[PDB]
Design a protein. Structure first.
Lengths: 93, 96, 176, 328, 112, 144, 156, 208, 156, 44
């Protein structure tokens, strides 16, 4: 997204205001902005359905992932979300 | 090295040694950068029994320095340690 | 156990004295050294053709810091801040807030490369392999401000070098 | 809009809340102005038209992200706009003592100042500090002084609250006034119209002018007032040159360069201005109004002219030249 | 307590005066050697100012050590071990004067 | 003798660079005139060659492209022009060319490697990624 | 220096940095040797002796080098000890002292080498001592390459 | 204990060092205040500051104590003691292949006799001690700043001296020289409190 | 125009000469000097590019600040820098020279050589690899190539 | 199984660790004789 001033808003919700003098730093130079918003990317990821009451996520790749954490799926409305990865898992109804 | 035999002979003669035997530049004796996946071993304490840390806690087995003498409340002469023994001349090459 | 360097008496045999005087007058040893340099002339030079030819490097090489992402695309960094603590030069500045989703996502991940010592403690400390020093050693700038890397800069560096970084980690994670 | 609360102890890393666009910063007065802004912790926007190499001297004068260099063109209003948009203070120092191929005295002293003032007002710049000359007069024969006064009026028209400063023969290490006299060796002896016996000049120290400019920016009542930076004492031109050559260990020999395509050694207007006695305006505020106390030329004379020593006067003999007589 | 050099304050004052004489006589040469822009009076004024800064001391031991430090600075100045900037460092110039009036400090910042 | 063989090999190198024109081109663009098997070429245009006979350090080399990312590189051969996947092979981190072993494809990975943009208008300017910490009070808009 | 560049590669192969490695850490070493590193170390050490000899061929016997080193900066043995000199300085004057021998640390007690000892205390003898130390270092390196034991690389 | 994790300890050297410490104490009861041998076999002799020269001379010339090498002379600043600075002399006896530490105490004002007469190496070490900590050494051939700047003020290694210091350097165009200005850090050195609230070593517990 | 064409071509000629025959002075202060030597070592050979190490600072064009600029050394660096003839360029090698690196919070370390002397190229690393330093020099050469000193004089 | 970088079975080969500087040139008498012979031929 882009601010009304014309400055692209970072994924950290930061955009130099119109009254901000610091905006001059991008006068003749581009504002480095990452164009893959992480929050949107995980939202794309589908919610896995695992019958087991408790599932464990390592992030994939074993030692190349994150510390293994066990997620409980008792909550019916909510979907178990990985603490590190953020992947959502559900228990089939 | 990719040098003519004449150049090799001249080089060796000027050096006085067979340089082609030991060329500084590395060509093919180098190890392949891509290597098989390793399997490093485990340590002596990677066991499921008789592994209580109390028996291997060297950090906690250190003790405060022992006070041999404190001013606060025929013996033979004592050296700090047995005198150092004279070094022995090398047998591979005594004099460089 | 000990070797006597020097400590060699000269023989006074008339032949030995003659050869010593021959060395002095005819400059034999200087000629020997000259021949050695001449031999070095006809060797093959060891210069690589930079930048068309690059020097050898190992997968464990430590260079430009980079923030990585999970295969899904989520930033691996879960704002534990232990890489900030371990950093021996206090170069990493991390500020985090609960994201709209609710995960620990940093709002500020600033590392001034002008203060970092490129030790690699940060990548060894990170529990999710988020901050990993990349393979790029050629990132010289013309202004000091550029060296100070923002979180966005780190994310872009990760996105650019991810293929190589992942390959190197896959080639070295077993050793670590 | 662009109002910043000052925070810090006034050091290099402090924030003084002065976003300033110092036009013509790559100049004798420009360096000192930027240095004062930098040492206070101000965002000095430096518009430059020369090579970036020539602007490197201004780089160490400020902390990281405090000195910003951006290219500007005096013939482009848009360049002026993008360089003063976020600035709360704009200082105009653009002025060349000799006319150029594409820039005449009118352009440098009228057209460029007016464009800066007009753009600054549209951008909403709080204060503008134009730098005129004390001898500037609408009917003065010299084009330099005449054009400077013409632009001064136009600056007030475009920028009503502009704080116009009129220094008089600023002297300093990289000055074109003291060093110019001490360079009379190239021009034979000491070329002095009528032996320079009817000219009394009032020279001002470089730091005094620069500090006054910074003080004027801070001063809340300085806005809209035409200040005139005068020197501590008025010296006879002949006595002044005699003193200059004296401390410079130079034989005092009391006695075309416009053609030079490279920076002219001497200008006809410069010659007239040199032999023109400095005006005295007692109706304008001076350095004392801004709080800066004028520093006598004598104290700072050696710092500018000891470097011009010939053989053995910076050491050995080191004869002390007494202060020259002041016509006061 | 073992005295550093002087057993009594009067002995310490003797050492202080000896140091002051050396500094007073060295100032003219120092201006010549480092080509300083300060006057001989200015340097001698600074010397007196520096001596008067530590004029509240009453312990002879402390006075002795102050003289020793004063000697060391003189030795470096005489031996040209210090540079021109080092000598000028005594004369704080670039540092902006910090006001003492409470109202001024109130405006300047949160300075306590 | 072998001298004739050396001269003939030089002429072979002249031919292998595509005639005298190409021979001079590689001579004046790279200052090296040896030939090697074309391992692969990146999309940007840089061509990668390997000769095992050459000693370690010169076994693998890259001929930089003439135009990359809208920049003339006929003479300005920036060292950062090398794409990330070819960086491993060129710097001898791995013995496997990216052509033989393609790197794992990820959506977040860039589709166009950019050389060091320092000194160019596309340079990176540092800034804070956080927001205002202390919110200020808004005075009422209605006169009392 | 090209040989020094080769050895710098060994640093980078095992730590990832050419000069500053931080590889030897309290408790052991950071990581295990990358597969193949030891083999390359053997190759370098095999051809390194020739390089040292080439250095000697150009300096050791050269009369100009001797004139600039022989009978220069002579230190008496007693002065060296009193002045707190150590290493080559002590050995240069003939003092038979070497911590790797007198006070063995790590597995230096399990390696066999010879301590070069000077005779005149001049720069030339110390130059010879430093050269011989390089030679004896290769002797230690060969032993380590043939005695490297299996196990972990950090205290468990 | 045993197993690779624990460091092997040699008791023989411990006994030898304890015996030699008693030897030194008996020979020099006038100055020796306390003798300690660490569990890692390092003999330490605590001596009254007046005995710096006599004790060192004994430890250097005595036939059965030929510590003729001053390995390192340093100071430890403990602000909780009246004599905050602790001067430590590390010695080496090549004849008996042993090392010893002579530890003495001093105040900010009390001078300490220079050991240059005993060990010529002491010159620069004592210069460093004076420069970093401020411990004046009496009868020193040339006591002056050795590591700090020429015009530097204060003793840096003192525990009460700020890590970043009080002054910083920069080049000023107006004065055409490098000038010293009050220190202003763009990013304050972030102090990290790492000490755990739980006791780690019971053996070194100070009873309340 | 023809005048612009002549000036531009002459400016390119002047730019080529300086960038081709850059003469650097080794202001080796700390660890980074060692890697600088490895740049001049046979493997990389800065001289191959025309960059020959000029010991005399009075005949140098590039000052490579390699190491930690301490407060005691700070005046010397500036004084040497102003005694360099122009055009003069400063290349900061190493984090210590760039912004103090490991010693940024030290009591006697200048927080970057940028404060003392204006810097043109910053080479990152601790120590920056010899290729990275060589890369910085080539970047400086390209920086000189972009310079248009004559063109601006003509268009003034 | 454990696959650490280990010495090869049988270990590495021998490594030279002593000065190899060879002996080259004729005897002093012979070298002087050769020089004098060249001188004599030149003179004649
Ligand atoms: N003694 C004095 O010098 C006095 C001068 N003044 C006036 O005050 C100002 C002081 O200037 P000072 O700092 O001494 O600099 P100088 O007069 O020594 O040098 C000229 C300055 O003006 C700039 N400049 C000149 N012409 C142009 C142009 N056509 N386009 C853009 N910039 C231009 C230069 O920048 P660049 O080099 O990039 O072109 C530089 O900053 C001038 O306006 C001067 O006329 C008033 C009283 C006394
Ligand atoms: C360039 C200028 C350089 C100036 C350098 C001058 C110096 O060396 S500063 C160190 C001077 N310090 C001292 O003399 C310490 C004196 N200590 C005192 O207590 C004295 O005031 C006495 C002993 C009370 C004497 O006081 P009176 O002089 O009687 O009142
Ligand atoms: S250590 Fe890794 S997960 Fe933790 S804050 Fe740093 S980058 Fe993020
Ligand atoms: S690599 Fe070292 S210096 Fe760089 S961020 Fe990590 S811990 Fe800090
Ligand atoms: S940047 Fe690193 S290698 Fe260079 S001087 Fe500083 S600490 Fe040493």
């Amino acid at each position: 997204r882009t601010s009304p001033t014309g400055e692209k808003v970072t994924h950290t919700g930061q955009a130099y205001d119109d009254g901000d003098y610091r905006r001059v730093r991008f006068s003749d130079r581009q504002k480095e902005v990452n164009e893959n918003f992480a929050i949107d990317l995980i939202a794309e990821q589908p919610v896995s359905e695992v019958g087991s009451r408790v599932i464990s996520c390592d992030g994939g790749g074993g030692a190349l992932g994150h510390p293994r954490v066990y997620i409980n799926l008792d909550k019916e409305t909510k979907t178990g979300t990985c603490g590190y990865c953020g992947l959502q898992f559900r228990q089939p109804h | 090295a990719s040098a003519t035999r004449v150049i090799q002979l001249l080089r060796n003669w000027a050096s006085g040694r067979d340089l082609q035997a030991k060329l500084q530049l590395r060509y093919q004796e180098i190890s392949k950068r891509t290597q098989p996946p390793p399997k490093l071993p485990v340590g002596p304490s990677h066991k499921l029994s008789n592994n209580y840390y109390c028996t291997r806690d060297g950090r906690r087995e250190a003790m405060p320095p022992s006070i041999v003498m404190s001013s606060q409340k025929e013996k033979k002469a004592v050296t700090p340690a047995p005198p150092i023994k004279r070094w022995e001349l090398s047998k591979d090459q005594p004099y460089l | 156990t000990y070797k006597f360097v020097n400590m060699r008496e000269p023989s006074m045999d008339m032949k030995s004295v003659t050869d010593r005087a021959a060395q002095t007058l005819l400059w034999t040893e200087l000629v020997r050294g000259l021949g050695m340099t001449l031999s070095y002339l006809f060797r093959e030079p060891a210069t690589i053709n930079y930048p068309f030819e690059k020097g050898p490097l190992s997968p464990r090489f430590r260079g430009e810091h980079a923030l990585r992402r999970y295969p899904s695309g989520e930033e691996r960094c879960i704002a534990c801040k232990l890489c900030e603590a371990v950093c021996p030069a206090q170069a990493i500045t991390i500020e985090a807030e609960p994201r709209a989703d609710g995960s620990r996502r940093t709002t500020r991940y600033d590392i001034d490369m002008t203060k970092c010592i490129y030790c690699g403690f940060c990548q060894e400390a990170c529990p999710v392999d988020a901050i990993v020093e990349g393979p790029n050693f050629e990132f010289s700038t013309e202004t000091h401000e550029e060296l100070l890397y923002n979180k966005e800069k780190l994310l872009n560096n990760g996105d650019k070098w991810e293929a190589e970084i992942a390959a190197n980690i896959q080639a070295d994670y077993l050793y670590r | 809009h662009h109002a910043l609360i000052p925070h810090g102890k006034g050091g290099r890393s402090s924030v003084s809340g002065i976003v300033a666009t110092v036009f013509g910063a790559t100049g004798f007065l420009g360096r000192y102005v930027v240095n004062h802004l930098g040492r206070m912790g101000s965002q000095v926007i430096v518009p430059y038209r020369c090579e970036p190499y020539d602007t490197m001297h201004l780089r160490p004068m400020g902390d990281l992200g405090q000195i910003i260099f951006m290219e500007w063109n005096g013939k482009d209003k848009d360049s002026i706009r993008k360089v003063v948009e976020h600035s709360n203070v704009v200082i105009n120092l653009v002025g060349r003592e000799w006319e150029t191929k594409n820039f005449d005295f009118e352009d440098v002293f009228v057209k460029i100042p007016h464009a800066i003032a007009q753009v600054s007002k549209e951008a909403g710049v709080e204060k503008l500090i134009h730098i005129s000359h004390l001898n500037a007069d609408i009917k003065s024969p010299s084009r330099y002084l005449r054009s400077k006064a013409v632009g001064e009026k136009e600056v007030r028209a475009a920028f009503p609250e502009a704080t116009i400063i009129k220094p008089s023969d600023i002297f300093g290490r990289e000055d074109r006034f003291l060093n110019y006299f001490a360079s009379m060796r190239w021009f034979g002896g000491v070329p002095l119209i009528s032996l320079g016996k009817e000219t009394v000049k009032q020279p001002v120290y470089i730091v005094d002018v620069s500090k006054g400019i910074i003080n004027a920016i801070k001063d809340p009542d300085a806005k809209g007032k035409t200040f005139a930076f005068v020197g501590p004492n008025r010296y006879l031109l002949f006595d002044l040159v005699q003193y200059i050559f004296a401390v410079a260990y130079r034989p005092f020999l009391p006695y075309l360069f416009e053609v030079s395509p490279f920076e002219p050694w001497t200008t006809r207007d410069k010659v007239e201005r040199v032999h023109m006695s400095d005006m005295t305006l007692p109706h304008l505020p001076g350095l004392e109004d801004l709080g800066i106390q004028a520093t006598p030329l004598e104290l700072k004379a050696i710092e500018v002219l000891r470097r011009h020593r010939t053989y053995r006067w910076l050491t050995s003999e080191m004869e002390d030249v007494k202060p020259a007589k002041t016509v006061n | 307590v073992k005295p550093i050099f002087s057993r009594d304050m009067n002995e310490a004052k003797r050492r202080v005066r000896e140091l002051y004489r050396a500094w007073y006589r060295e100032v003219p040469n120092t201006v010549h050697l480092f080509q300083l822009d300060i006057s001989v009076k200015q340097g001698r004024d600074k010397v007196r100012e520096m001596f008067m800064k530590n004029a509240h001391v009453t312990d002879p031991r402390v006075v002795d050590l102050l003289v020793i430090k004063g000697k060391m600075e003189l030795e470096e100045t005489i031996n040209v071990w210090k540079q021109r900037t080092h000598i000028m460092r005594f004369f704080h110039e670039t540092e902006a004067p910090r006001p003492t009036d409470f109202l001024s400090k109130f405006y300047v910042g949160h300075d306590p | 003798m072998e001298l004739v063989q050396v001269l003939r090999r030089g002429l072979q190198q002249v031919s292998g660079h595509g005639g005298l024109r190409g021979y001079l081109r590689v001579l004046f663009r790279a200052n090296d005139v040896r030939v090697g098997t074309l391992v692969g070429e990146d999309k940007y245009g840089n061509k990668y060659y390997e000769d095992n006979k050459q000693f370690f350090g010169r076994h693998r080399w890259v001929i930089y492209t003439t135009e990359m990312n809208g920049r003339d590189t006929f003479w300005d051969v920036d060292g950062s022009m090398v794409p990330p996947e070819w960086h491993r092979w060129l710097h001898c981190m791995t013995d496997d060319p990216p052509t033989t072993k393609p790197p794992t494809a990820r959506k977040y990975i860039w589709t166009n490697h950019k050389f060091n943009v320092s000194g160019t208008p596309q340079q990176y300017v540092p800034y804070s990624t956080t927001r205002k910490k202390i919110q200020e009070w808004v005075p009422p808009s209605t006169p009392y | 220096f090209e040989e020094r560049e080769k050895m710098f590669e060994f640093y980078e192969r095992v730590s990832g940095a050419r000069m500053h490695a931080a590889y030897i850490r309290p408790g052991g070493v950071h990581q295990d040797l990358p597969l193949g590193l030891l083999d390359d170390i053997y190759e370098f050490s095999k051809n390194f002796s020739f390089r040292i000899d080439e250095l000697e061929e150009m300096l050791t016997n050269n009369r100009i080098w001797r004139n600039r080193t022989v009978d220069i900066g002579v230190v008496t043995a007693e002065d060296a000890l009193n002045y707190g000199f150590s290493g080559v300085m002590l050995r240069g004057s003939g003092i038979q002292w070497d911590l790797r021998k007198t006070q063995p640390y790590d597995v230096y007690d399990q390696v066999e080498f010879d301590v070069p000892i000077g005779s005149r205390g001049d720069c030339y003898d110390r130059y010879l001592c430093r050269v011989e130390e390089m030679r004896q270092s290769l002797r230690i390196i060969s032993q380590c390459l043939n005695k490297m034991p299996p196990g972990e690389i950090k205290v468990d | 204990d045993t197993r690779p994790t624990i460091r092997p300890r040699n008791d023989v050297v411990h006994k030898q060092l304890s015996a030699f410490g008693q030897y030194v104490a008996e020979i020099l009861p006038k100055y020796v205040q306390q003798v300690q041998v660490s569990c890692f076999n390092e003999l330490e002799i605590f001596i009254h500051p007046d005995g710096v020269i006599p004790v060192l001379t004994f430890l250097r010339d005595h036939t059965n104590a030929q510590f003729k090498s001053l390995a390192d002379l340093t100071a430890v600043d403990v602000p909780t003691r009246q004599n905050r600075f602790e001067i430590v002399y590390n010695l080496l006896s090549l004849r008996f292949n042993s090392r010893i530490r002579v530890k003495t105490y001093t105040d900010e004002l009390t001078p300490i006799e220079s050991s240059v007469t005993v060990y010529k190496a002491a010159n620069w070490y004592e210069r460093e001690i004076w420069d970093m900590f401020g411990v004046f050494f009496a009868n020193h051939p040339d006591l002056r700043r050795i590591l700090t700047d020429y015009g530097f003020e204060g003793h840096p290694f003192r525990k009460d001296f700020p890590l970043s210091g009080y002054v910083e350097l920069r080049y000023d165009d107006e004065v055409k020289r490098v000038v010293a200005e009050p220190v202003e850090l763009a990013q304050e050195f972030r102090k990290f409190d790492l000490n755990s609230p739980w006791e780690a070593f019971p053996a070194y517990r100070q009873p309340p | 125009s023809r005048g612009e064409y002549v000036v531009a071509k002459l400016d390119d000629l002047v730019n080529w000469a300086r960038r081709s025959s850059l003469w650097p002075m080794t202001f080796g202060l700390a660890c980074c000097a060692v890697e600088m030597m490895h740049m001049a070592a046979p493997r990389y050979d800065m001289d191959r590019f025309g960059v020959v190490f000029r010991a005399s600072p009075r005949q140098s064009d590039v000052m490579i600040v390699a190491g930690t600029l301490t407060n005691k050394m700070a005046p010397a660096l500036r004084k040497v820098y102003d005694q360099m003839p122009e055009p003069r360029y400063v290349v900061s090698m190493g984090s210590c020279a760039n912004g103090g690196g490991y010693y940024h919070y030290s009591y006697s370390v200048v927080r970057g050589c940028d404060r003392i002397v204006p810097v043109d190229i910053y080479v990152p690393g601790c120590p920056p690899t010899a290729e990275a330093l060589l890369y910085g020099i080539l970047q400086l050469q390209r920086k000189i190539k972009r310079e248009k000193r004559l063109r601006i004089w003509y268009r003034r | 199984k454990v696959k650490q970088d280990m010495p090869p079975p049988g270990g590495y080969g021998p490594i030279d660790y002593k000065r190899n500087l060879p002996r080259r040139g004729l005897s002093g008498y012979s070298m002087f004789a050769v020089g004098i012979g060249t001188l004599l031929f030149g003179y004649w």
